[PDB]
Write a protein that binds this DNA or RNA. Structure first.
Length: 54
DNA sequence: TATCCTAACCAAAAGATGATTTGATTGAAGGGCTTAAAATAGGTGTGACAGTAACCGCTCGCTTCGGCAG
């Protein structure tokens, strides 16, 4: 039941999705953002320490 | 007033933060090798041997069966 989450159809061997389609390619040319770009992760103190070390 | 903001705080979604439990990895040991040699004692199967075996474009010569001969 939980295996049908997005992408709905995923490659069974590799998990890859289909290649870029016409509509998506034209959208990317037009520079329209997607709903997956708004996912932003807060900085954990662990992450801050790692970046200081880096 | 009807309604709201969102300072500081309560109920819930989500978003996150470290301690703990379970899926997963492996370090070391059971184990069971190696050729290298030297040796007596052995069993036979088998794989050469060998044999037959079998299966798999132009121009002459030569011939016959009747139509008159005898």
């Amino acid at each position: 039941m939980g295996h049908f989450m997005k992408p709905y159809f995923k490659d069974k061997v590799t998990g890859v999705g289909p290649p870029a389609n016409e509509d998506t390619r034209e959208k990317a040319a037009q520079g329209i953002k997607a709903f997956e770009e708004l996912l932003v992760t807060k900085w954990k103190n662990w992450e801050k320490a790692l970046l200081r070390k880096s």
